Amino acid sequence: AEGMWVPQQLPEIAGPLQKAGLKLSPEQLANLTGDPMGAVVALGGCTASFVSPQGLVVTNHHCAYGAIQLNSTAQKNLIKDGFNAPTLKDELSAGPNARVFVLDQITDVTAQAKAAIAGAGNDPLARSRALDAFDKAQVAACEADAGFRCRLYSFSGGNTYRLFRNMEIKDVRLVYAPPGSVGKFGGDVDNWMWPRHTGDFSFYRAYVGKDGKPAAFAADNVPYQPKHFLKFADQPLGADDFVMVAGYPGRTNRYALAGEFNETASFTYPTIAKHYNAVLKMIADAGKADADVKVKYAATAASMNNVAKNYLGQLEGFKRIDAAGQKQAEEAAVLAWLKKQGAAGKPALAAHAQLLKHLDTSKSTRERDLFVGQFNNTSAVGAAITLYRLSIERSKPDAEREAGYQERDLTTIEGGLKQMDRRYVAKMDQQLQTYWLDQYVALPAAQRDNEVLNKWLAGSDAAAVKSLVNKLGGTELGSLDTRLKWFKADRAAFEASNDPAIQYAVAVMPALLKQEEQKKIREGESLTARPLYLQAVADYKKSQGEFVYPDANLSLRITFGNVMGYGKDGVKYTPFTTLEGVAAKETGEDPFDSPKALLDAVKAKRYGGLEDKRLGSVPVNFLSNLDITGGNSGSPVLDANGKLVGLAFDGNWESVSSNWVFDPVMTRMIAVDSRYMQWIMQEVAPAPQLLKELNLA
Amino acid sequence: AEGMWVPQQLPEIAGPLQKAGLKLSPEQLANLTGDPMGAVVALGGCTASFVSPQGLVVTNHHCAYGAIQLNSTAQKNLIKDGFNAPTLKDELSAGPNARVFVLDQITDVTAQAKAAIAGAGNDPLARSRALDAFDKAQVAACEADAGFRCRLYSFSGGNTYRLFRNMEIKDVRLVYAPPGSVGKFGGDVDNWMWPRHTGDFSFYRAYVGKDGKPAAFAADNVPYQPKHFLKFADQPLGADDFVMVAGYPGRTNRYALAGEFNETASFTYPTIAKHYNAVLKMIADAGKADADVKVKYAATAASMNNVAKNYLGQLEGFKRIDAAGQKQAEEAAVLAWLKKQGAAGKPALAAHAQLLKHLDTSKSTRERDLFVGQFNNTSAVGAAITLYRLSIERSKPDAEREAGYQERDLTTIEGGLKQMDRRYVAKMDQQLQTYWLDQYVALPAAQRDNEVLNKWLAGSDAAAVKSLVNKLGGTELGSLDTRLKWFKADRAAFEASNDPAIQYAVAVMPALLKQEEQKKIREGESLTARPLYLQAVADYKKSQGEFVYPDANLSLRITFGNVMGYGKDGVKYTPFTTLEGVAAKETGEDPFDSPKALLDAVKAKRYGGLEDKRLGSVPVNFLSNLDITGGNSGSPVLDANGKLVGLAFDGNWESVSSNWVFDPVMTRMIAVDSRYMQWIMQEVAPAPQLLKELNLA
Ligand SMILES: N[C@@H](Cc1ccccc1)C(=O)N[C@@H](Cc1ccc(O)cc1)C(=O)O
Ligand SMILES: N[C@@H](Cc1ccccc1)C(=O)N[C@@H](Cc1ccc(O)cc1)C(=O)O
């Protein structure tokens, strides 16, 4: 079924849920801290779920990838080898910034948020500061009890605001990862593709301090005891079976203006894909010369591969469904429908005209902004900018500090500085600085108008770039101890440093704060125009009997449907893959290089009690017509009785353009079957302690 | 069904043919100059069929591609535009070397063939001279009537010889070609692939002189009046329908030794694919800089792309089916079964040992012979060699001249010199000479032992090469009038020439005739062993219950089966594509750039009365489990009642390795539906005169 339904829309999908095959009462799904919705957790960018009473959490391999990479070395490469912890004491810290968010409360605060915005009058910067202040005040009251973290969410262009309260677990440990050749079978070749044969799962465990409250990693921390956890399905999942997903989709753009779509299609997507593909070649080459580079950059290389391929898929999809035609026609129908409404429709029409004006702002600054943006986000420079920015915010009262630099963010900033030790090599950073500066100096002189960067380059050719990278090479911010000292330093110490990375951050900061102020002005203008126009689009959609649900915004959503394949001319994709399809793809070369114990077990038909007689094998991956996006990775797929039948991890090639224009015919979720996850842990990469904990052995 | 069945085997398949759903009688098929089989003709490298009483011939577009190519200029490009001849006199010569072969009779001359070989004795060279003389003599007699061509075919390794007698139609004209965006929709991207949407068809007309004997092109030749022509099906072809193909498959290698397969898989296919891919990049780069280069090298680039992609598919297929293992296990089972046959086993056991020592002769000289072979076959140099060779052979009497340089070959040689005019650009041929010499001068010193070439290079780097290409550019053989002068010149005029390409021909010819003697010796030693070992395999296969049929050898074969898809893990390929599939593949960029009139008709559901209700659209291509190969292109696909339901044109990706090891699971023919052919000639690139002549209007 189409839709990323908010829990508050359960009454509207209760009948469709039952019709599709839900055997739980839709009522049971509305208790978001009960069984089973209470077992679903956010990781920050991925979904996961509790699967034991001792705080075992299951998610995708690609969601645990960062944690696995932080614990990998060139010599002991867990990404390649996998990992198992036989006992609690063998579990590895997932890193200081790993989180498990357990939902405690959702509050509707729409009327209060709208009153705070209106309270600001017709000044856009005051409107942006009013919502900021409201957001900070809600979050401070909601976080007064130790161990909670809150977040204010804007829905439907700012027509609805809800405050989420979560227990924030800060001690997350790695328990199990299959080998990379299972976890990421087919690599970037099979990424965004069906047929699919990827065992995309791993396990964490949540820990708390001995006092029961969240704590950073410590030896005497103990496993979290969740109130609810999911059970692995005892009923074999088959074609046409009801499935549903609860998770944290990040961002969809189905309500974007035609011009926002056109800009993304004609500039953002092709341009990011081009540059990311070129940076990836550079990282791949450096990785072949030094395995330390390969391991330290593995998470970046993985994310950049995923985005670049997703973008190429979205562009193909737009042509497939004529997304440009469909956006143009819908926007024309909404503006014509408003007109026929007379008086009542003039506000939305004026809100449209205003958003329409916001587009053109980036035309001959978009290339510059990209290159300067990427240069400033390289590791040493970005660390210098964050550290200098924090030194400025610390001089203010906490309620006046920029979101991201308040007291409640300090441990996350510090964790980032710590995680950079596992993700930084000077010789690779210099190549990244060189790459983005090179693109900058190749712009026409009109567009290369970053005056600070112009001063530090003192040229617009290869030698000027080499000279600046040589200069920035003298930085000490590669040192973890140096970064942790700067983390506590006052503004004056930054301003006195002869560290060239720090000098660069001090020099660019005034222009950065002015660019941020301009952003907040544009935000404040949108805080009134966006909701008016998006409410009209939603009203129009309801007039046309179309499904109305908010764009994803990193909050909890439910999607449902059935196990089913899809088709193109000449082809029908079947809803399951099987073990034989894994062995049929074997080449012995990355990324089609399965463990020997897998190839041996498939050749012997060792199905380990998990064969589905309807398939004649153990199922590997399955297709369903659910509505997921980035952020849904690791979401539990629940059957009609709320049991775990698999994890969401990807979509088929034709699904990716549904970020902009949903296509029900060729949009499918790809999930890993809970039976394959059990089969891998039995036959290939043994986890006997985990199968016991899951009551599967 | 497996098998390229010779017409004599009709008894054995009579029943399976009927089980499959054949509604005509097998006796009807044994009538080879009758209906329907008498409609089926050979083009030499392609199959075709009579489809009107006025000599109308249908074949594939890629079979007609050379003809279309010859009639194309950078200005008037019929590859891109297509072609239609509304009247007889608008029909374009398909070229001097274009033929239609109509089968007159098959006689077995095995005994006399085995006599000729025996009655030479031991001396390998005498054995091959003997077979050549018996071949020349049997042909000279069979061709005594003015308008016939005869060919001696060796089957099952030389266990069976047959003389084929054909009426040779020498005046073939192009009537109709769709646009290249239809004829070759999907280009080298969709080549060897399903799903497929290619309207791979074109029409020729067979002309003879007013006397009724075949003749070369002349203004007052009239159309041939075939005894038999096929009718286009009125019964709609659907899934599971019986289909059969008659045609001229070129070469299969299912009876090759495990060692011949190992050489092809380990050296020949990888090497050819690599060097062809690099030459194709060059021709693509040159054609983009010069539209005259693009058109003149279109046919060469098309053939090299087809071969390169085919080989990559064969290598991939070998790994899918473990061809290496199956060939080793068969070569080991045959020897074990012969060593249990006692006295009856020993002649085949000795024949194997004799053949097993023709393998270790190449490892050192294979790269050299490839690179020198390719260089010698560039256009100016290749013309120079052939023309000088003919002058050598002219001075001998006819029956002692090399096969291909006889009186009966003069027209084909002269045709080749004329065709070169539309296939030669000096700067491209120099790029080709450069590529291949460059590969030669890259070889280790020990392998670089072509005396004349080392002499002419005087060095072993890019500069020495450029020096020789510079020398050779001085040729006048780029001129057609020059090539026709040399065609009628004697040995001494060649040996007096200061033309550097003629000078190269004369200089290399001694080493060439030496190498050709050591080749005929090679052939001689094999001519008795090969028969004996291949009969043992046939007997072993017959003993195991496995189908026995000879490897393709360019003679007439029948294959049969049913319209059916295939699958692999997670995917079922359905047996038909449809119009909507063509439209869905549209990018507006070559090779997915359909005529506007196609895209307009698809949108508008103008099905032209050609809807299949079961598909809900007009079908485009279909799949079936027939056994075809190179040569079978343009073969009529006949339904249960011997009516034309389409043309064979390609095979799916997994089919191509069946040239060495047949696989019934994933081997399918791809054919163009006769309703797509009509629909194109009605709705898209009209041919109202053809529809009339075919009785479809
Ligand atoms: N494409 C996946 C990540 C991946 C990379 C390589 C190998 C295996 C997986 C991905 O981006 N998944 C999303 C979830 C998602 C996104 C869009 C969609 O249509 C369906 C699923 C994620 O990581 O959250
Ligand atoms: N691959 C085709 C030629 C072609 C190229 C590009 C577009 C369309 C057609 C080809 O080689 N066809 C063969 C017939 C054939 C060969 C092998 C096989 O398994 C099935 C059919 C031919 O030209 O005769």
GROMACS .gro file of C-alpha atoms in nm, chain B residues 380-518:
model
  139
 1077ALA     CA    1   4.501  -0.210  -4.813
 1078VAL     CA    2   4.743  -0.487  -4.695
 1079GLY     CA    3   4.471  -0.760  -4.723
 1080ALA     CA    4   4.381  -0.646  -5.081
 1081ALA     CA    5   4.759  -0.644  -5.165
 1082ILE     CA    6   4.806  -1.007  -5.037
 1083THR     CA    7   4.485  -1.149  -5.207
 1084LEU     CA    8   4.563  -0.970  -5.542
 1085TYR     CA    9   4.931  -1.087  -5.543
 1086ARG     CA   10   4.814  -1.445  -5.445
 1087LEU     CA   11   4.559  -1.451  -5.733
 1088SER     CA   12   4.838  -1.345  -5.983
 1089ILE     CA   13   5.050  -1.645  -5.851
 1090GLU     CA   14   4.748  -1.887  -5.888
 1091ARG     CA   15   4.637  -1.749  -6.232
 1092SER     CA   16   4.963  -1.890  -6.391
 1093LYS     CA   17   4.871  -2.247  -6.269
 1094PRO     CA   18   4.593  -2.454  -6.434
 1095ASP     CA   19   4.245  -2.430  -6.272
 1096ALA     CA   20   4.218  -2.759  -6.071
 1097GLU     CA   21   4.567  -2.702  -5.906
 1098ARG     CA   22   4.483  -2.339  -5.800
 1099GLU     CA   23   4.402  -2.287  -5.425
 1100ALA     CA   24   4.023  -2.312  -5.343
 1101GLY     CA   25   3.904  -1.946  -5.340
 1102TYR     CA   26   4.144  -1.844  -5.626
 1103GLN     CA   27   3.976  -2.060  -5.900
 1104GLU     CA   28   3.784  -1.924  -6.210
 1105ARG     CA   29   3.457  -2.000  -6.016
 1106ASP     CA   30   3.581  -1.760  -5.733
 1107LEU     CA   31   3.697  -1.465  -5.959
 1108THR     CA   32   3.353  -1.289  -5.937
 1109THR     CA   33   3.359  -1.307  -5.548
 1110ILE     CA   34   3.720  -1.173  -5.535
 1111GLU     CA   35   3.633  -0.884  -5.773
 1112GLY     CA   36   3.311  -0.829  -5.569
 1113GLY     CA   37   3.522  -0.795  -5.250
 1114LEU     CA   38   3.754  -0.534  -5.419
 1115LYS     CA   39   3.441  -0.330  -5.523
 1116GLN     CA   40   3.269  -0.364  -5.178
 1117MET     CA   41   3.591  -0.225  -5.012
 1118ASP     CA   42   3.512   0.115  -5.183
 1119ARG     CA   43   3.217   0.155  -4.935
 1120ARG     CA   44   3.421   0.011  -4.639
 1121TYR     CA   45   3.766   0.191  -4.659
 1122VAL     CA   46   3.899   0.520  -4.512
 1123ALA     CA   47   4.281   0.558  -4.516
 1124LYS     CA   48   4.310   0.724  -4.170
 1125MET     CA   49   4.089   0.446  -4.015
 1126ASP     CA   50   4.282   0.159  -4.188
 1127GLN     CA   51   4.609   0.323  -4.062
 1128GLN     CA   52   4.458   0.333  -3.706
 1129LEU     CA   53   4.380  -0.046  -3.749
 1130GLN     CA   54   4.734  -0.127  -3.884
 1131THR     CA   55   4.875   0.081  -3.590
 1132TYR     CA   56   4.662  -0.106  -3.326
 1133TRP     CA   57   4.768  -0.457  -3.446
 1134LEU     CA   58   5.140  -0.375  -3.513
 1135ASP     CA   59   5.143  -0.213  -3.162
 1136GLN     CA   60   5.025  -0.550  -3.016
 1137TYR     CA   61   5.297  -0.729  -3.222
 1138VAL     CA   62   5.587  -0.501  -3.104
 1139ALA     CA   63   5.464  -0.547  -2.739
 1140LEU     CA   64   5.549  -0.924  -2.755
 1141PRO     CA   65   5.864  -1.066  -2.588
 1142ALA     CA   66   6.170  -1.084  -2.826
 1143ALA     CA   67   6.142  -1.470  -2.854
 1144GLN     CA   68   5.777  -1.449  -2.986
 1145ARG     CA   69   5.860  -1.151  -3.226
 1146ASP     CA   70   6.008  -1.372  -3.501
 1147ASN     CA   71   5.810  -1.263  -3.811
 1148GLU     CA   72   6.123  -1.197  -4.025
 1149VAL     CA   73   5.962  -0.965  -4.290
 1150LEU     CA   74   5.766  -0.759  -4.031
 1151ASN     CA   75   6.078  -0.710  -3.805
 1152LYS     CA   76   6.262  -0.605  -4.130
 1153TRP     CA   77   5.980  -0.353  -4.220
 1154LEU     CA   78   5.944  -0.227  -3.854
 1155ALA     CA   79   6.325  -0.199  -3.798
 1156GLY     CA   80   6.238  -0.150  -3.425
 1157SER     CA   81   5.990  -0.263  -3.156
 1158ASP     CA   82   5.807   0.055  -3.025
 1159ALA     CA   83   5.525   0.303  -3.125
 1160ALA     CA   84   5.777   0.507  -3.334
 1161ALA     CA   85   5.890   0.203  -3.550
 1162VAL     CA   86   5.513   0.123  -3.602
 1163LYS     CA   87   5.426   0.487  -3.701
 1164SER     CA   88   5.730   0.466  -3.938
 1165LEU     CA   89   5.584   0.153  -4.113
 1166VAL     CA   90   5.221   0.285  -4.116
 1167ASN     CA   91   5.371   0.609  -4.271
 1168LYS     CA   92   5.554   0.392  -4.534
 1169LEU     CA   93   5.238   0.189  -4.613
 1170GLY     CA   94   5.016   0.504  -4.641
 1171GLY     CA   95   5.202   0.566  -4.971
 1172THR     CA   96   4.987   0.284  -5.129
 1173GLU     CA   97   4.741   0.359  -5.421
 1174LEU     CA   98   4.532   0.046  -5.328
 1175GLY     CA   99   4.287   0.284  -5.151
 1176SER     CA  100   4.168   0.350  -5.512
 1177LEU     CA  101   3.910   0.102  -5.658
 1178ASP     CA  102   4.030   0.153  -6.023
 1179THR     CA  103   4.385   0.068  -5.886
 1180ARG     CA  104   4.252  -0.256  -5.718
 1181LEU     CA  105   4.067  -0.365  -6.040
 1182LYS     CA  106   4.390  -0.292  -6.247
 1183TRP     CA  107   4.593  -0.523  -6.011
 1184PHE     CA  108   4.307  -0.784  -6.025
 1185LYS     CA  109   4.396  -0.847  -6.399
 1186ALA     CA  110   4.779  -0.790  -6.362
 1187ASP     CA  111   5.038  -1.079  -6.382
 1188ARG     CA  112   5.291  -1.196  -6.114
 1189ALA     CA  113   5.576  -0.983  -6.268
 1190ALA     CA  114   5.383  -0.646  -6.264
 1191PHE     CA  115   5.335  -0.713  -5.885
 1192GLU     CA  116   5.710  -0.798  -5.834
 1193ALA     CA  117   5.808  -0.479  -6.032
 1194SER     CA  118   5.573  -0.252  -5.820
 1195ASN     CA  119   5.714   0.021  -5.585
 1196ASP     CA  120   5.366   0.041  -5.410
 1197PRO     CA  121   5.460  -0.036  -5.044
 1198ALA     CA  122   5.148  -0.259  -4.978
 1199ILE     CA  123   5.225  -0.460  -5.299
 1200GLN     CA  124   5.594  -0.466  -5.184
 1201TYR     CA  125   5.472  -0.603  -4.844
 1202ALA     CA  126   5.247  -0.872  -5.007
 1203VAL     CA  127   5.537  -0.995  -5.229
 1204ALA     CA  128   5.786  -0.991  -4.933
 1205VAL     CA  129   5.558  -1.190  -4.686
 1206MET     CA  130   5.407  -1.434  -4.949
 1207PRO     CA  131   5.687  -1.702  -4.916
 1208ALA     CA  132   5.638  -1.730  -4.533
 1209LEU     CA  133   5.256  -1.728  -4.606
 1210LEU     CA  134   5.258  -2.030  -4.850
 1211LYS     CA  135   5.505  -2.212  -4.612
 1212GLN     CA  136   5.257  -2.156  -4.322
 1213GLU     CA  137   4.969  -2.278  -4.552
 1214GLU     CA  138   5.165  -2.603  -4.631
 1215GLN     CA  139   5.227  -2.666  -4.253
   0.00000   0.00000   0.00000
